[PDB]
Design a protein around this ligand. Structure first.
Ligand SMILES: O=C(NCc1cccnc1)c1cc(-c2csc3c(=O)cc(N4CCNCC4)oc23)cc2c1OCCO2
Length: 134
């Protein structure tokens, strides 16, 4: 079976918004979301229908841009780097599970290159906008 998707809320985790996290949603995530190769990563992986053996034993932290989107919309992240690591995990999950040079790997690599380019547009100084304590 497929496990439930990753959490996008946590009662013990404070909610936070920064100017960096805003840019990640409005520009970085949006740019990747409109990319030609976004569609395999817009939702959690369906290992059953895709015939991916032992995907959730090897991939212990599944991640997708739909989860990242919901986490940004509901201020799940502590800061921008926690969001960046979800992008990073999404890419490396595909890299460690598939043969280098495979189609899905080429798609992930193209998204990561665009991701690195858009991340360079991030405001260097962090501006906290709001914190909602848990
Ligand atoms: O390829 C996909 N659809 C093929 C297809 C069939 C019919 C019609 N249209 C397209 C595919 C792959 C991932 C996806 C995200 S990560 C990841 C990974 O690590 C390894 C693999 N695979 C699957 C292919 N064999 C190699 C290993 O797929 C993924 C997610 C998806 C996909 O389509 C549906 C939406 O959600």
């Amino acid at each position: 079976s497929n496990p439930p998707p990753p959490e996008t809320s946590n009662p013990n985790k404070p909610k936070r918004q920064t100017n960096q996290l805003q840019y990640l949603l409005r520009v970085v995530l949006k740019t990747l979301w409109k990319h030609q190769f976004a569609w395999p990563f817009q939702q959690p992986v369906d290992a059953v229908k895709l015939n991916l053996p032992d995907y959730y034993k090897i991939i212990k932290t599944p991640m997708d841009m739909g989860t990242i989107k919901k986490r940004l919309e509901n201020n799940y992240y502590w800061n921008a780097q926690e969001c960046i690591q979800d992008f990073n995990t999404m890419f490396t999950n595909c890299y460690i599970y598939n043969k280098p040079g495979d189609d899905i790997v080429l798609m992930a690599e193209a998204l990561e290159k665009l991701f690195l380019q858009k991340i360079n547009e991030l405001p260097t100084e962090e501006t906290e906008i709001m914190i909602v304590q848990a």
